[PDB]
Every structure is written in structure tokens, then in C-alpha cells.
Design a protein around this ligand. Structure first.
Ligand SMILES: *[C@@H]1[C@@H](C(=O)NCc2cccc(C(=O)Nc3ccc(Nc4nccc(-c5cccnc5)n4)c(C)c3)c2)C(=O)CC[C@@]1(C)C(=O)OC
Length: 353
């Protein structure tokens, strides 16, 4: 008879399979309704995220279709994986909602930054992130939306990536979505274009956040962000200014020039674990890697491959999380389609279950 069951949670009607019970929602209150439940069949706890109405507009279905198809066919330690997908409606007529279950994680990367950590833990967390993005870049996907709230870790400091970002499609910084400007690159904020090193900037800001305990570049508005970057890092050299668009090229030069601060005073030894030569040398190496990754000019930005071979990170090097086989997604398309086609397109995968 019935294979789905109902409960009204978080001001919303939630209906999924009976295998999961004792629904407990996330208290974060963030967009995307997800609750924690326990799956009886395989004896593991699960996180379940509901699509409210995937087809409210063209922006929704495009991102919803993207994340389902690619999460189904990439399989990596540092990227979150998909276990089951289903929707209660059995025909497309009233098919209107979709649910996604996946492996549960203990916490966000945000809260992990609050608790003091050590170099062994910090680096392994970054190592995982770089091979998470390196596995994505090899597939041809630029995240550009990396932030602590899109990153989850477990009790063993195993890190997994929650989001697939925009997959290198949209280049706008403020869309109809992300509540964070802080971790975004200088090129994206200036609309100068992006390459594969854009994401290196955001892992640099996240890494710097662990050391200090606060957001590295806190910007109240779109343009405060740029001011905060150059208040601490210094004004860029003229060669960087040439490629900028003239309308806002003018503005950067007319904006005041700041010499900037060096990473030793940006990241002092007090915030690091210290008093040891191992600690002092690990404090050096951490700051040195921050310098290579927190570069305004994209051309001197350290690559993810070189970042993995940095002494601070290479201690965890083993090819199977890093040098994985590239995931292949041949249904692939660069095009946008009808709203009715969108439901029919996603209906195929959820009903070919
Ligand atoms: C950090 C940031 C922050 O999150 N800080 C503390 C905090 C406050 C309130 C709630 C939470 C919270 O709910 N955390 C949390 C709870 C459960 C889970 N479980 C979970 N597991 C697997 C998968 C998912 C998931 C996956 C996909 C979509 N949705 C959920 N969920 C998780 C991961 C997290 C935490 C802030 O809120 C602001 C302040 C910040 C920036 C800060 O102070 O950093 C220094």
C-alpha cells in the first residue's frame, strides 16, 4: 500500500519513506530543508534534503538538475556522495517535490574553526579540501562558491564537500543562494574572469580563518570586500590593473593606496601553536603557504597541484584520494530548456530509480 509517510516539520510538510524515522531537523535554519534520521535497512544515520519546488523558475531547475546528476556519478572521499533519491508522487502530473538522502556528517567546517585545533588537524582538513577540489577541477568543474557552510567534517576530521557550486557557468557575484562574499576571489569581485586557481583563494581565506578565529576579510557590502582585501594585503601592482575593466579600473586606482601587511603580522606566532621548533617551523610553513595562495594576481596564485606538494600538506599524500580516476558524465549539456522539459528531465532520473 503506502510506501511513503508524512510529518509537518520546520513550518513545512515533509514526506519521505518510512525507513527513516524520528525526524530531527537542523537548527541552522539555512536554505534547503534537511533533517537527520536513521535508516533501518543499512543501519546508518542519514541527512535528507528536500526540493521545495524544483521548478519555481529556470534558475532553480538548472542548479537542481546539475547537483543530482553529478553527485550520482562522482565518488570520492572528500566529496559528499548520494545514497538514494526519490519523490512520493508517482506520475509527472503532480510530481512537484524531490528528496535527497546522503551520508550524515557530524558538523560544519564553521563550528570546527571555533574550537582550537592543531597543525596536524588543520592541514589534514585542507589536504582533503584540495584533493576534493582537485578531483572536481580534473572533471572540469570550478566551484567558486567554497565556504565553511558548504563544508562538512566528521569526528575523525574526515572532510566532505556539500555543494557543487555553479560548475563554472555563472560569473556574477550576487544572484537571486550564497550569503557569503568573504571567501570570494579578487578577480570574480572585479569581473575579470576566472581560471582554475579561483578556488585557491577561498581555501586560503578559510585556512586563515582557523588561525585567527574570525573572518579574514569581513565585508559589509560588495565593495567593502575589495577594500578589506587591499587594506591588509596591499594595493596591487600596475600590471594587474591593465586587464581590469576600465569602468572599475578607474575606481581601483582612485581608491586609496595601502601598503598592506605581511603575513607575519597578519598571522602572528601567538595565534599559532608555538614554544616549539616544530611549532615555529610549522608556523613558518603555514604562513608561507598562505602567502602563495592569498595572492591578488591570479597568475602568481599557487596551483592546487603545487599546493598539494607543499611541505605543510604533502605529509598526507597518497594517490587514491588525490590521483583518483576522473569522473565521466556523458545527458550532459550546456543548454537551458523548457520548464516542462526540466520536470520531465529530472523525472527520468528519479523514476528510473
Ligand atoms: C560558523 C557558522 C556555524 O555553523 N556555527 C555554529 C552553528 C550554529 C547553529 C547551528 C549550527 C549547526 O546546525 N551545525 C550543524 C548541524 C548539523 C549538521 N549536520 C549535517 N550533517 C551532514 C550533512 C548536513 C547537510 C548537508 C547538506 C545540506 N544541509 C545539511 N548537515 C551540520 C553540518 C552542521 C552551527 C555560523 O552559523 C555563523 C558563524 C560561523 C561563520 C563562525 O562563527 O565561524 C568562526
Amino acid at each position: 500500500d503506502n510506501n511513503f509517510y508524512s510529518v509537518e516539520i520546520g513550518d513545512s510538510t515533509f514526506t519521505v519513506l518510512k525507513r527513516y524515522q524520528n525526524l530531527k531537523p537542523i537548527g541552522s535554519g539555512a536554505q534547503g530543508i534537511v533533517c537527520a534520521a536513521y535508516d533501518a535497512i543499512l543501519e546508518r544515520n542519514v541527512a535528507i534534503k528536500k526540493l521545495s519546488r524544483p521548478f519555481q523558475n529556470q534558475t532553480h531547475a538548472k542548479r537542481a538538475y546539475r547537483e543530482l546528476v553529478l553527485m550520482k556519478c562522482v565518488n570520492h572521499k572528500n566529496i559528499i556522495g548520494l545514497l538514494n533519491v526519490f519523490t512520493p508522487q508517482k506520475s509527472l502530473e503532480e510530481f512537484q517535490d524531490v528528496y535527497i538522502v546522503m551520508e550524515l556528517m557530524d558538523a560544519n567546517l564553521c563550528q570546527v574553526i571555533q574550537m582550537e585545533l592543531d597543525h596536524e588537524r588543520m592541514s589534514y582538513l585542507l589536504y582533503q579540501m584540495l584533493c576534493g577540489i582537485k578531483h572536481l577541477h580534473s572533471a572540469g568543474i570550478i566551484h567558486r562558491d567554497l565556504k565553511p557552510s558548504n563544508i562538512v567534517v566528521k569526528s575523525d576530521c574526515t572532510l566532505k564537500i556539500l555543494d557543487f557550486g555553479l560548475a563554472r557557468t555563472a560569473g556574477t557575484s550576487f544572484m537571486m543562494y550564497v550569503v557569503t562574499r568573504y571567501y570570494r576571489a579578487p578577480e570574480v569581485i572585479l569581473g575579470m574572469g576566472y581560471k582554475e586557481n579561483v578556488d585557491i583563494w577561498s581555501v586560503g581565506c578559510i585556512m586563515g580563518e582557523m588561525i585567527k578565529g574570525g573572518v579574514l576579510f569581513p565585508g559589509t557590502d560588495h565593495i567593502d570586500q575589495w577594500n578589506k582585501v587591499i587594506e591588509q594585503l596591499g594595493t596591487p601592482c600596475p600590471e594587474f590593473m591593465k586587464k581590469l575593466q576600465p569602468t572599475v579600473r578607474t575606481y581601483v586606482e582612485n581608491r586609496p593606496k595601502y601598503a598592506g601587511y605581511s603575513f607575519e603580522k597578519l598571522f602572528p606566532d601567538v595565534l599559532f601553536p608555538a614554544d616549539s621548533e616544530h611549532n615555529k617551523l610549522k608556523a613558518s610553513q603555514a604562513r608561507d603557504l598562505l602567502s602563495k595562495m592569498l595572492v591578488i594576481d591570479a597568475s602568481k596564485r599557487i596551483s592546487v597541484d603545487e599546493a598539494l606538494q607543499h611541505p605543510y600538506i604533502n605529509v598526507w599524500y597518497d594517490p587514491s584520494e588525490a590521483e583518483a580516476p576522473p569522473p565521466k558524465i556523458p545527458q550532459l549539456d550546456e543548454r537551458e530548456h523548457t520548464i516542462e522539459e526540466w520536470k520531465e528531465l529530472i523525472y527520468k532520473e528519479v523514476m528510473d530509480l
